[PDB]
Ligand binder design. Sequence first.
Ligand code: BCL
Ligand code: BCL
Ligand code: BCL
Ligand code: BCL
Ligand code: BCL
Ligand code: BCL
Ligand code: BCL
Ligand code: BCL
Ligand SMILES: CCCCCCCCCCCC(=O)OC[C@H]1O[C@H](OC(C)(C)CCC\C(C)=C/C=C/C(C)=C/C=C/C(C)=C/C=C/C=C(C)/C=C/C=C(C)/C=C/c2c(C)ccc(C)c2C)[C@H](O)[C@@H](O)[C@@H]1O
Ligand SMILES: CC(C)=CCC/C(C)=C/C=C/C(C)=C/C=C/C(C)=C/C=C/C=C(C)/C=C/C=C(C)/C=C/c1c(C)ccc(C)c1C
Lengths: 56, 358, 357, 360, 127, 122
Amino acid sequence: AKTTILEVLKKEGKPMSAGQIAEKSGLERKEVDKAMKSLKEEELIVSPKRCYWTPK
Amino acid sequence: VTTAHSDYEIVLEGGSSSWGKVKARAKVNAPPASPLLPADCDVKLNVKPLDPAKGFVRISAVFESIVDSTKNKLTIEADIANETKERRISVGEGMVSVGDFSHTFSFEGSVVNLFYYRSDAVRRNVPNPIYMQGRQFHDILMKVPLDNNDLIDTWEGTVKAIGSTGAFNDWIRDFWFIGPAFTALNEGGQRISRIEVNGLNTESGPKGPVGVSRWRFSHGGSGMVDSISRWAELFPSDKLNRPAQVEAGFRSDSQGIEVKVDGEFPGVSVDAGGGLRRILNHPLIPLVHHGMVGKFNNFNVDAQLKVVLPKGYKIRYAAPQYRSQNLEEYRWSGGAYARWVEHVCKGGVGQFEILYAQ
Amino acid sequence: TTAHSDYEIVLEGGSSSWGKVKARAKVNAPPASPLLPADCDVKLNVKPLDPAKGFVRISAVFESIVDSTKNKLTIEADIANETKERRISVGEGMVSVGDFSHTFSFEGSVVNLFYYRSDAVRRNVPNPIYMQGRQFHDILMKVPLDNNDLIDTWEGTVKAIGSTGAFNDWIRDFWFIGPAFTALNEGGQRISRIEVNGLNTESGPKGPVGVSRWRFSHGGSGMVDSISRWAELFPSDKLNRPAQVEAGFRSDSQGIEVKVDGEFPGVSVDAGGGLRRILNHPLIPLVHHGMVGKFNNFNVDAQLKVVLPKGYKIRYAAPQYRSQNLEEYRWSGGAYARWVEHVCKGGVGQFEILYAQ
Amino acid sequence: NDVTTAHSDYEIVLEGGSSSWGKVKARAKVNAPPASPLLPADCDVKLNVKPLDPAKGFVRISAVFESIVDSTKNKLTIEADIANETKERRISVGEGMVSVGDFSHTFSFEGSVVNLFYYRSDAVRRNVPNPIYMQGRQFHDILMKVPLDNNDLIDTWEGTVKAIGSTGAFNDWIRDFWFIGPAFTALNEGGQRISRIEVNGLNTESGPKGPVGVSRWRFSHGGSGMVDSISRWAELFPSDKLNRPAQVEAGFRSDSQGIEVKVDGEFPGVSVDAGGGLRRILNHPLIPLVHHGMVGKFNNFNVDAQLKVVLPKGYKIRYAAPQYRSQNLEEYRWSGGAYARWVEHVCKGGVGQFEILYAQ
Amino acid sequence: RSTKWYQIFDTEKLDDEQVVGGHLALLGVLGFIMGIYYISGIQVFPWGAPGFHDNWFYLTIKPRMVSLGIDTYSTKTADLEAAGARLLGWAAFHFLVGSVLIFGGWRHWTHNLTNPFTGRCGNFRDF
Amino acid sequence: SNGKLIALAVGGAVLMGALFFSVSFLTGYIPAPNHSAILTPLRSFMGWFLLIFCASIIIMGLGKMSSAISDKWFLSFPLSIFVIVMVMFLSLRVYWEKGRTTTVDGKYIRTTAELKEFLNKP
Ligand code: BCL
Ligand code: BCL
Ligand code: BCL
Ligand code: BCL
Ligand code: BCL
Ligand code: BCL
Ligand code: BCL
Ligand code: BCL
Ligand SMILES: CCCCCCCCCCCC(=O)OC[C@H]1O[C@H](OC(C)(C)CCC\C(C)=C/C=C/C(C)=C/C=C/C(C)=C/C=C/C=C(C)/C=C/C=C(C)/C=C/c2c(C)ccc(C)c2C)[C@H](O)[C@@H](O)[C@@H]1O
Ligand SMILES: CC(C)=CCC/C(C)=C/C=C/C(C)=C/C=C/C(C)=C/C=C/C=C(C)/C=C/C=C(C)/C=C/c1c(C)ccc(C)c1C
């Protein structure tokens, strides 16, 4: 297939969505709230990665 | 870097059913070799057993392709049957359409394929007779209604040329192998005999004049020609007890090529010997004819083959060994298989022998 | 292994397709010649001679040095497209190899007949590439034989034609030496048996001149430029100025160096809708050089500069350009490098460049 | 990019003086699939030749091919007395036996081969020092007798006799029967134009073995100078230089994983006199290169090749294109740089020159 | 079958030069890890801030460092800062030399023994 | 379409969170000396999911590591671990344990003698 997930040494990551979700927001944790953003980013990073990551 | 990402899948059926779901996607960043681009095409091949008593299968092929800025379409629909073990008979119709032009045709051609040696000393000694030298004659009677003016003009031109040019029979050869075909032909071991035009006739039909042409030619194969050596293996009309489908296509631009293929058809599995089955011997004409395009860019393959055996079947041999096994699905990924993919994509005819048995 | 190439196209203004083409190439790969130290200094020239009849005077020189052997060939010609399918040339020239030298003169008529000229294909396909056809090629050659080698060669040719009736068939092996015969098959060409109308000889100002009126047929399946694009390769009408191409070439064990510099017309064509097209790439060069381009892997360092008449901006560059600075479009790397490797190794894919009026 | 390894070590041990003899060793390993649809493919070839009759021109050559393809054993033996009659003609009177699996049959043959160049120009020979492309044509006039002592043998003979006398196109299509597989491509890929054959005899008799089928056929094959069997006609068969039994043991063991090649043999003709006491290695035959190019272009590879030239005592190399890397006072070694480029060039089908000139 | 993911680097699939390259790349990796461990024993940075805590890696390899004078068993902050500077220098040396080792192992693994500064290649079989 | 797979998975996670919150309200518990009853159940559910998700992605990623591992990983596999390990060590200094743990004053207790002198404060 196209094999969108393209592992390379330049594999910083080039999906627009999961790229913007590569944010951490693990700082100012306030474990209930911003670590929930850590959870959200892990979810929305794995979901595209499992679907498709690098079309660029 | 010119990567080539491919994924192939072969789901099989148990027993003696040679039926297979063949799926295949591919994406190559190398430019295609078509002097006109972009080139897009979709090809459908649906065959159904029409009259099994006489061995007739109705096979319909639809090609729809955009080249540069022109749309082209070639539809055909023919009942084909095995008149004998060496002769095959086809009665069919079809049409071509290119932009602001189109014409239908009806044909009643017959194909007689016969080898040059049927010795039993070879059949009992070589269990895998890849090369089989032979000659395949075609006696083609085709009728075209000359509804359009250009059809009539070309009919008149052909009538003038055949009746005046003493070297039409051989120059037609390099006519109807347009461009690189006449090269690839010779690169596949295929020879073409000087045609004989048994007759041109303006036998008018019920709705206008009809150009009827009967001509006989013959193409000879040095064994690398699958249309000759694998003759009986090309036509699993015996195996066809239900409709068989193929839906392929490719989209090509200067950026690269994409290929899709999804089919359900027999002839995928053949008996190697002693209850042992085998994914059919790879045809060599596609490989050698691909070598005329596959040797133009240096590419790195990311290929993954997925042979899903029927419930209760095991692979007893794989020349490039399988990468992984999921108790019915055998996966080839990287390693020697990647080398073999790079080998065949560039025109190689190496053996990929998958032997499997219950 | 590296292949550094710099191309530079400078198109003339107005409807004229005149262009100056420069190409400096250096490849660190071994050539495919059984004699490696191969140098050439090709110099083709053409000037108008009679526009009333379209007669143009071509002057080509092919000085070369292969394995310390000086091989030079010069051709002067006066060529005209009389019928647009029949082209007639009267010319002369000389061939010299080492200490050997001999002159010749020729009168040649070439009739390029297409198999089909149907209007459906032309009106439906906007860019017809593969136009299969056949050239019927008649030549009257007048060669003075003022040397022992020429005399005994002429006698041997007469003896061979008088001895074997397969001379017409077997001369093709002698005619395309080395892999040239294969270049007929890879390039889609097919040369028919020659037809000798007479091997005469006449008294001349100095000794005898041998006269050979021989005719053959070169068919093309469409991949042949000389067959498909017979009309567009000889723009005698567009020759408003002298044209000149100089191609220097060097090859040793280390690598190959190519140096092309040529002002000529026909480097652009009409495509309809007011958009001119950088001409379709000839197919024979690519598929004949691919017979040697597959012998080594290489890294592409190619750069193409396209200089156009001002205001004639490019549209639909496929592959796309990299840098544009006011009529200097630049291709370097990316899909262009892939296409350069494609055509170097034998590919004939399209590099479609259109520029507006 | 990903490429396959190709290791190779070649050695040419040369003798000095008028002796053009040479030992040739060659080991090669390729981590690339072969182009054989029948795999695995093992093969061992043993060519042994001896001077049968000095002062008469007759040598005896013994070729022993053996192979194991797809678990099928094949073996050809040929023992032929060959002699150059004239400059352009030679004669071979020989016997042999082919075998495949259980089947096997013997044969005998008498064959006159003429090799006529298309020109005899003194202008070319006075100027060109390396006449590589010497176009011409070879005419074989082979007569051959086979003892038909098998049901399959007699069936094949019956089919042949009923085919030749039935279809007049037999002489044209016998070639596409005769060059099996991709060999037909290799006909023209090397410039070799095999011509329509002429069956001059299809008789049979009763010999000591029973029914014997005798067939005489003449066939001409041309060459555009790329055919080493034509241009190098007087250099490929040095009967005069064979004062000692020469041997060549070649073989390969091509599995799906790769190809292992082993060659070891001594024979003359390795060196020719380029003039002025400047000996040289013979011009590389181009047919093997262009024919191997069909298979060598299928995979991209990096090659490490070690060419060793063991010159005789007191012999100095004068020019080598590409240049030698290390001399060791007799063992001129090529490896890497431009020589690796040349090895890739020829292993992919190139015909580039390697002009080793050496003089005492 | 030798295609299991734990048989990928099997000896049958590797040449002597490939093994050379693998060992050199692993030794450069080893130097990088050694630098990491060294900079894991820098109790007080020369920058002038509290540094890494103790780990079993560095506490394992610390007696050797003291034996070699690189580290110290002194409580004085200035001397510990100087020894941390020594550790940083040795770790940087390890990082650079291990990078060179990984580079050489890559070249041997890729069968490309060509000098970046000179176009002259080299023969693994004859050097 | 894998969109429905992710939709079902995220819906299941959201439903787990909502159920945890609802039952936390149902189950009568004194929240804490300081913490609330709105955030603590969500903190516990974050731990729950993050654990399950981390284990699942580790399993899946290591499976695909075993699937995709080849010789071409010669530098991709080792160096990656190197960097991650490097990152880990740096994460120990800058994020987890920021310093050497000197006293509030900053006396750098580093020998057992001064530890004995310290633990016996007057
Ligand atoms: C008129 C043409 C002939 C014919 C010609 C050939 C030739 C020639 C070959 C086959 C091959 C095969 N054919 Mg068939 N085939 C015929 C009728 C049939 C019928 C039938 C009962 O009608 C069936 C079931 C099959 C099925 C099969 C399989 C036995 C086999 C491919 C197996 C594989 O895995 O495919 C995998 C399939 C895919 C990769 C999909 C390919 C899809 C494309 C669109 C089809 C090829 C198009 C080609 C490149 C373009 C040609 C266009 C023309 C110019 C118009 N053919 C008709 C009568 N067939 C090959 C084989 O293996 O022989 C042993 C082979 O060599
Ligand atoms: C190459 C493919 C075809 C071919 C196609 C053509 C075409 C097309 C033409 C001829 C023409 C001629 N051909 Mg021819 N011809 C071929 C093989 C042959 C052979 C042979 C040895 O087999 C012979 C003896 C001839 C003989 C001849 C002459 C009778 C005649 C005039 C020669 C001329 O002046 O040359 C001068 C020679 C040179 C200029 C050398 C370089 C030739 C190359 C092909 C030029 C490429 C153009 C270059 C890219 C740009 C040039 C710009 C300059 C400013 C001009 N041809 C093959 C089979 N032939 C012409 C004609 O018909 O005359 C009436 C003509 O238009
Ligand atoms: C005798 C030969 C024929 C002829 C045969 C051909 C053939 C065949 C071709 C052309 C091609 C072209 N020719 Mg012309 N052409 C002739 C007469 C002319 C005249 C003229 C007024 O006399 C002119 C101006 C041109 C000009 C041109 C262009 C329209 C075009 C190249 C465009 C390009 O970008 O070039 C870029 C130019 C460079 C890359 C420089 C190349 C320089 C080399 C030295 C030329 C090729 C030499 C060849 C490899 C070796 C010849 C060996 C022979 C044995 C001598 N030709 C004569 C009559 N011409 C090509 C074209 O586009 O066809 C549609 C083409 O394929
Ligand atoms: C290969 C290209 C040409 C060819 C070119 C030649 C050449 C050149 C010669 C012959 C010779 C012969 N050819 Mg022939 N011939 C070909 C095809 C054929 C075919 C066929 C396949 O149908 C037949 C029946 C023949 C028939 C014959 C015989 C009449 C004769 C001796 C055969 C034999 O004993 O060789 C013995 C066979 C072996 C030695 C096996 C290996 C053959 C290879 C080519 C030799 C490689 C030598 C190696 C590089 C150096 C090794 C050193 C050793 C010490 C010898 N040829 C093709 C078309 N033929 C000879 C002759 O003219 O006899 C009068 C001769 O000199
Ligand atoms: C019947 C066959 C012909 C013949 C056909 C050819 C042809 C054709 C060629 C040679 C070549 C050579 N032959 Mg001879 N050869 C004949 C008899 C001889 C005799 C002899 C006195 O009988 C001798 C000493 C030689 C020796 C030689 C050398 C002069 C030269 C190779 C030099 C080199 O370094 O090789 C290095 C050798 C090796 C690499 C060993 C290769 C081992 C294999 C087994 C031999 C090639 C086999 C081929 C690939 C497969 C044949 C399969 C067929 C189906 C039978 N041949 C007979 C009469 N020989 C070549 C040469 O350069 O000519 C000038 C050449 O072109
Ligand atoms: C020094 C004592 C041992 C020795 C120790 C090792 C060790 C230890 C290793 C090898 C490895 C290899 N050995 Mg050893 N080796 C020895 C002698 C030999 C000899 C010989 C005598 O000729 C041979 C033929 C080999 C053969 C080989 C190859 C199979 C392989 C190197 C190629 C490659 O893939 O590397 C590159 C290999 C890798 C890319 C894969 C392994 C990557 C590792 C897991 C990355 C770890 C990074 C880092 C440590 C992470 C931080 C962790 C924290 C420290 C906690 N060894 C001696 C006898 N060898 C390595 C290999 O993988 O073997 C299969 C390996 O692990
Ligand atoms: C090798 C790949 C890595 C590397 C990885 C390591 C590892 C791993 C460690 C060190 C450690 C050290 N490294 Mg270091 N190091 C490398 C390059 C260097 C270089 C340099 C010249 O570039 C230098 C000066 C140093 C310096 C040092 C010291 C600070 C320290 C102690 C070394 C010493 O005792 O070795 C003494 C070495 C010699 C005596 C050379 C001979 C070693 C013998 C052969 C070891 C095997 C013995 C065993 C019994 C087997 C024998 C088998 C046969 C019978 C012979 N490294 C590269 C970057 N470095 C050590 C550490 O931190 O200690 C806590 C440590 O263990
Ligand atoms: C990181 C250092 C690596 C390494 C990385 C490189 C690099 C990088 C290059 C080579 C090149 C070559 N190496 Mg090394 N190589 C190593 C060890 C070896 C080993 C081995 C492991 O057994 C072998 C078989 C070789 C063999 C070879 C040659 C084929 C080639 C030099 C040709 C010659 O004439 O050069 C004459 C000198 C050589 C034989 C010396 C080669 C080894 C090194 C450079 C010096 C000795 C080792 C020393 C203790 C450590 C210094 C390393 C430096 C920090 C780089 N090296 C060391 C341990 N190798 C070089 C090249 O091709 O040169 C033209 C090159 O550029
Ligand atoms: C240890 C962590 C778990 C990891 C276990 C691994 C699972 C199998 C994984 C395969 C194992 C294997 O072998 O291969 C690994 C292969 O991986 C990869 O493939 C993939 C398929 C892509 C992996 C992804 C699978 C999946 C998305 C991930 C896993 C699935 C997930 C989402 C797991 C979690 C599911 C959930 C959360 C389960 C629980 C959900 C249900 C619950 C909690 C019920 C609630 C009850 C309700 C209704 C109310 C309760 C109630 C009652 C009763 C009374 C009163 C009151 C008040 C109340 C509230 C590569 O491709 C291959 O290379 C590799 O090989
Ligand atoms: C010519 C001939 C015959 C050849 C002779 C040529 C010679 C002499 C040989 C060269 C031999 C040489 C010099 C070769 C040297 C090779 C080296 C140094 C490779 C080291 C690999 C490290 C590995 C496998 C990683 C293991 C990782 C693990 C699991 C660690 C797990 C772990 C532990 C333990 C604790 C905590 C945590 C968190 C983890 C994760």
